[PDB]
Amino acid sequence: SMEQVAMELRLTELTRLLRSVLDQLQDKDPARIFAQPVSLKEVPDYLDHIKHPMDFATMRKRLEAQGYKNLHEFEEDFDLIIDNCMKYNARDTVFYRAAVRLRDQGGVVLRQARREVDSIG
Numbered sequence: 001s002m003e004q005v006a007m008e009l010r011l012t013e014l015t016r017l018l019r020s021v022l023d024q025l026q027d028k029d030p031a032r033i034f035a036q037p038v039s040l041k042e043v044p045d046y047l048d049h050i051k052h053p054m055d056f057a058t059m060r061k062r063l064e065a066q067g068y069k070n071l072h073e074f075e076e077d078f079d080l081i082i083d084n085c086m087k088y089n090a091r092d093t094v095f096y097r098a099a100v101r102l103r104d105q106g107g108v109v110l111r112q113a114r115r116e117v118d119s120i121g
Contacts, residue, residue, distance in 0.1 A: 005068060010121075011066050011069075012066070013120070014068070014069075014070070014071075014117070015063060015064075015066050015068070015077060017113070017116060017117065017120075018063055018068055018071070018074050020108070021109060021113045022029060022060060022063060022074075023076070024055070024109045025056075025102070025109055025110075027031060027054070028055050028101070028102050028105040028106055028109075029098065029102055030074065031094075031098060032095075033085075033095060033098045033099075034056050034085070034098070035055065035056050035057060036054055036055055036056075036057050036083050037053060037055045037057065037058060038050075038055070038088075046088070046091070049088050050084045050087065050088055052080055052084070053080075053084060054077050054080035054081045054084060056081070058121075059074070059077050059081075060076075062077070066116060067102045071113060071114060071117045072119075075110060076112075078106065080101045081099075081102070082099045082102060082116065083096070085099040086099050086100070
């Protein structure tokens with residue numbers, strides 16, 4: 001149908017906007033701490049601690065499959081990255097501190113994204 005096509009154009013455009021959001025958030029992680037999945041070879045007990053692992057490469061795979069239906073879903077994944085790190089790592093660690101800085105800096109980007117998503121529909 002023509003409606004399914006229109007719906008698909010909207011998803012494609014959301015995917016375009018979320019790609020730009022993802023790039024901007026990932027720039028706030030210059031140490032690349034959150035770039036890839038925590039390695040189960042190197043942290044063999046990880047899944048005993050963290051039930052839903054997340055990282056920027058994993059988000060990017062979902063994004064490029066047009067797997068985010070709305071900004072809420074995308075934000076859920078970004079928040080997992082931060083919240084998983086803040087649980088597994090102690091306060092006095094470069095990892096925890098990196099997550100705090102990512103959360104704080106990302107807030108700004110995500111605030112305007114929400115306005116853009118609502119504004120453009």
